[PDB]
Amino acid sequence: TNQLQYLLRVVLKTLWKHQFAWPFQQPVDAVKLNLPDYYKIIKTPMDMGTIKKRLENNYYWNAQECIQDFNTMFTNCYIYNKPGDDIVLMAEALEKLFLQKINELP
Ligand SMILES: CCNC(=O)c1cc2c(-c3cc(S(=O)(=O)CC)ccc3Oc3c(C)cccc3C)cn(C)c(=O)c2[nH]1
């Protein structure tokens, strides 16, 4: 699929190089961040590092399964954190960029 290739080379690359990307490049380490309720509240943790590994290792059935992983990453952040928190503001900025790049999807 050309769309999965676009998601890796264009969408993921643009988001990964953004200034607000770093807290989204790896799973949330709830142990080192002392968030013992994170895995109870967030049933499907998702991050860009896991999406990258999934795109590189032929995990996805289709482009929609990948777009759903990016949406899960954003809403997991909105569910766990409070509105107005910096992490929510960072996810909102990345989401706006993601929707823009996903509008030019082949
Ligand atoms: C209500 C309470 N919530 C949280 O303290 C909370 C933290 C995070 C982090 C997060 C992950 C890492 S990391 O090094 O593990 C991964 C690379 C490091 C810092 C992180 O956050 C901070 C940021 C961005 C700035 C200042 C301080 C912190 C703790 C990610 N994301 C996606 C979250 O949703 C989330 N929530």
Side-chain angles (χ1 to χ4, degrees), residues 22-24 26-29 32-33 35 38 77 80-82 85 87 90:
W22 68 273
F24 303 96
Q26 302 129 270
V28 169
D29 197 324
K32 92 177 180 164
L33 300 168
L35 312 169
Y38 191 87
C77 182
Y80 190 75
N81 308 290
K82 288 96 70 217
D85 279 4
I87 192 66
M90 290 169 90

